[PDB]
Design a protein around this ligand. Structure first.
Ligand SMILES: *[C@@H]1O[C@H](CO)[C@@H](O[C@@H]2O[C@H](CO)[C@@H](O[C@@H]3O[C@H](CO[C@H]4O[C@H](CO)[C@@H](O)[C@H](O)[C@@H]4O)[C@@H](O)[C@H](O)[C@@H]3O)[C@H](O)[C@H]2NC(C)=O)[C@H](O)[C@H]1NC(C)=O
Ligand SMILES: *[C@@H]1O[C@H](CO)[C@@H](O[C@@H]2O[C@H](CO)[C@@H](O[C@@H]3O[C@H](CO)[C@@H](O)[C@H](O)[C@@H]3O)[C@H](O)[C@H]2NC(C)=O)[C@H](O)[C@H]1NC(C)=O
Ligand SMILES: CC(C)(C)CC[C@H](NC(=O)c1cc(Cl)cc(Cl)c1)C(=O)O
Length: 654
């Protein structure tokens, strides 16, 4: 078929080993900035001692720098608090003697080239969080629950509040936080007060009361608020940093139930609502651009109690794709894929030339199922969850099983090149996988119960593989390390030698394999989401299309660190299909027309009563968030009020 010529030579001088000696217990690994190569490894022993190593060559070599931390014990609960973007900021938290007035931290702002010791006025309880806007601003919680802020990269710390439960950095250096009063975080549960500060402690606005918890997702601020003289609670949303609030058109839940933001962006949110009682599943709801109107998207969606596992996944390598796990009435688990932001859900197409397993009734008719967080959690033989990278268009890699449900059997690895529309067995049996050079190189390692010395690699998007021995002395493989963003050609293999054990990391550079830099000819045209090429509206997902330039399976070259995915939108004509029913409307039968509700029951009535103005004055239809269609159809009707249809049954006072 097709394999790389004279590869053994191209990799030998490019392979780079490093023996880390030690390293019983902890082994933390942190990348520090993009296009640097700075990696930091932190090993903690016990009677103990700590050991820190720094690389600058993508993990090909390290230099022990415990010296830079004046040789002290470092707490791994806090780990290595790394700064955003290329701020080069690193914050290690030291262990102090019991009687101390406050903690101690080591800090670098120069990619771990120089560390600064700093004693604190408090004892940290949380990892110091960096502001997304300014890397010099940090916030933390004391063991006393006081909110401490710093405006000088942890040099000077000022307590800005005292009974803080949870705090979070918003956009433009804002800080959101809850506070208790009568006892503790656990006590005042659902009775807490949500606050905000834009002047890092100077002023404070109470932005909520009877708060159970809060969270940020995309453009929204969600907070669960507890019912007056009741154990139940419901979601409320603010798109204006707490200033204005509005109840979410979602069910209310009990103390034994939860809400989880499965996914959030500038357009909408995927919200998991736990089903009442120990079920180990809930319901997925997709929001509108206001984060208020919700559409039931998926039933019996696996999500163990509390949080807890979920197989919910954003297939980051193709627009609108998400795979998750649903629970069958006959207590089996099925994988469901959505190509249109959870509009429509369906089974994953089984690979063409693939046989159905013992889980399936028809031996010729079944689907692909994916092993993710939940499978992993059940000590099922899954070394890795599904992996997709946004720069590697259409590629999805996962351990799955072809059949009617997720099977306990030892999984093989499956790949997709079109974002989950079509699948193919990539490798037999479990493996650890990585995407290099934006789909230029796919790299694999077998999940053996005994030592290994080989790395498998592909240059044709997992269609053809090649074995390569990287070491004479095999190792008990532990994991892989590659620079986030899947742009490098440097992969770090990690393990430990057979015993008197010692950790080691062989780092291969694939620079000589892809000695040729890609050029215009190497890329071909690809219409994302193609189903029927005859159809004019083919590839129309969420109102538009996208034509890509993708490197040929054929072409075997380097896309380069500067690689820019080139895509091109084709704006489609609006149809009813680009609209969700606003509040008080529903879609009966196969029909796409949003019909007015005969009567509003459950939580629709709750909102119909306890809700508000704009959301109730419904146009009947709303444009799907992220929907960029133009022309065609539009709901030709006036903005009509509904706080009459509910109240029409209630005897009303004067
Ligand atoms: C599922 O995964 C998808 C792929 O990762 C997610 O979609 C991607 O979302 C990102 C971020 O929204 C889009 O990338 C760009 O992000 C920037 C935001 O960065 C900063 O830009 C400026 C300058 O700093 C400023 O506005 C802020 O500081 C921002 O923080 C946007 O400004 C760009 O316009 C652009 O959106 C990707 O384009 C997008 N890709 C795809 C394939 O969709 C998706 O959101 C995930 N799904 C959910 C529901 O979360
Ligand atoms: C794999 O790892 C090697 C190091 O082991 C990486 O090498 C680094 O290569 C970059 C260029 O690609 C060098 O950056 C510098 O860029 C400026 C321009 O901004 C230029 O003026 C400098 O002369 C230099 O090229 C970097 O110094 C170099 N580092 C080392 C230690 O060799 C390599 O980039 C990694 N491979 C991939 C594909 O990411
Ligand atoms: C308004 C929100 C942001 C959604 C929080 C609301 C709260 N959330 C949680 O308890 C919770 C939190 C996490 Cl991080 C994960 C899980 Cl699975 C559950 C609830 O259920 O009242």
């Amino acid at each position: 078929c097709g394999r790389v010529r004279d590869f053994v030579a191209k990799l030998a001088n490019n392979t780079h080993q490093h023996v880390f000696d030690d390293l019983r217990g902890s082994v933390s690994l942190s990348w520090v900035g993009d296009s640097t190569g700075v990696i930091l490894v932190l090993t903690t022993f016990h009677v103990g001692q700590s050991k820190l190593y720094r690389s600058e060559d993508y993990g090909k070599n390290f230099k022990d720098i415990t010296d830079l931390i004046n040789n002290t014990f470092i707490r791994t609960e806090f780990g290595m608090a790394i700064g955003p973007e290329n701020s080069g900021k690193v914050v290690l938290t030291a262990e102090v003697s019991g009687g101390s007035r406050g903690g101690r931290i080591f800090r670098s702002s120069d990619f771990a080239k120089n560390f600064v010791q700093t004693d604190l006025p408090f004892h940290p309880l949380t990892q110091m969080m960096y502001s997304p806007q300014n890397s010099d601003y940090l916030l933390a919680l004391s063991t006393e629950n006081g909110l401490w802020v710093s405006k000088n990269f942890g040099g000077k710390w000022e307590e800005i509040h005292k009974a803080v439960c949870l705090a979070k950095w918003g956009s433009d250096n804002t800080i959101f936080f809850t506070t208790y009063a009568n006892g503790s975080c656990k006590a005042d549960l659902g009775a807490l007060e949500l606050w905000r500060t834009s002047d890092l402690g100077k002023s404070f606005k109470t932005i909520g009361v009877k708060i159970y918890s809060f969270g940020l997702g995309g453009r929204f601020l969600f907070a669960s608020v507890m019912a007056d003289k009741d154990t139940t609670r419901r979601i409320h949303v603010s798109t204006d940093q707490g200033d204005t609030w509005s109840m979410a058109q979602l069910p209310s839940v009990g103390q034994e139930q939860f809400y989880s933001i499965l996914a959030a962006n500038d357009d909408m949110v995927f919200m998991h609502v736990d089903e009442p009682g120990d079920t180990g599943f809930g319901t997925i709801f997709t929001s509108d651009d206001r984060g208020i109107v919700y559409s039931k998207s998926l039933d019996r969606h696996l999500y163990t109690t509390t949080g807890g596992e979920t197989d919910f996944t954003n297939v980051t390598s193709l627009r609108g794709v998400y795979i998750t796990s649903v629970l069958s009435e006959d207590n089996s688990i099925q994988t469901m894929i959505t190509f249109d932001q959870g509009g429509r859900w369906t089974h994953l197409r089984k690979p063409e030339n693939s046989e159905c397993d013992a889980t399936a009734k028809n031996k010729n008719e079944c689907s692909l199922h994916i092993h993710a967080s939940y499978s992993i959690s059940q000590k099922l033989n899954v070394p890795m969850a599904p992996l997709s990278e946004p720069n590697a268009v259409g590629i999805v890699i996962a351990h799955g099983s072809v059949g009617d449900a997720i099977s306990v059997m030892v999984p093989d690895v499956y790949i997709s090149d079109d974002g989950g529309y079509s699948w193919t067995k990539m490798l037999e049996g479990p493996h650890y996988y990585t995407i290099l050079d934006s789909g230029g190189i796919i790299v694999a390692i077998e999940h053996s119960s005994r030592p290994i010395n080989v790395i498998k690699f592909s240059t044709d998007e997992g269609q053809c593989w090649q074995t390569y021995t990287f070491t004479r002395d095999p190792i008990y493989f532990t994991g892989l390390a590659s620079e986030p963003g899947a742009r490098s050609m440097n992969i770090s293999i990690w393990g430990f030698t057979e015993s008197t054990s010692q950790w080691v990391s062989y780092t291969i550079d694939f620079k000589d394999i892809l000695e040729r830099n890609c050029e215009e000819k190497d890329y071909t045209i690809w219409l994302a989401h193609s189903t029927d090429p005859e159809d004019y509206e083919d590839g129309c997902i969420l109102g538009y299309k996208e034509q890509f330039l993708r490197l040929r399976k054929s072409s075997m070259c380097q896309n380069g660190r500067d690689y820019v995915v080139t895509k091109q939108p084709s704006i489609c004509l609006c149809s009813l299909e680009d609209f969700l029913c606003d509040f008080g409307y529903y879609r009966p039968e196969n029909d796409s027309k949003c019909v007015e509700q005969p009567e509003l029951k459950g939580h629709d009535l709750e909102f119909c009563l306890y809700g508000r103005e704009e959301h109730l004055t419904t146009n009947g239809y709303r444009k799907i968030p992220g929907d960029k269609c133009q022309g065609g159809v539009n709901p030709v009707r006036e903005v009509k009020d509904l706080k009459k249809k509910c109240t029409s049954n209630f005897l009303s006072p004067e």
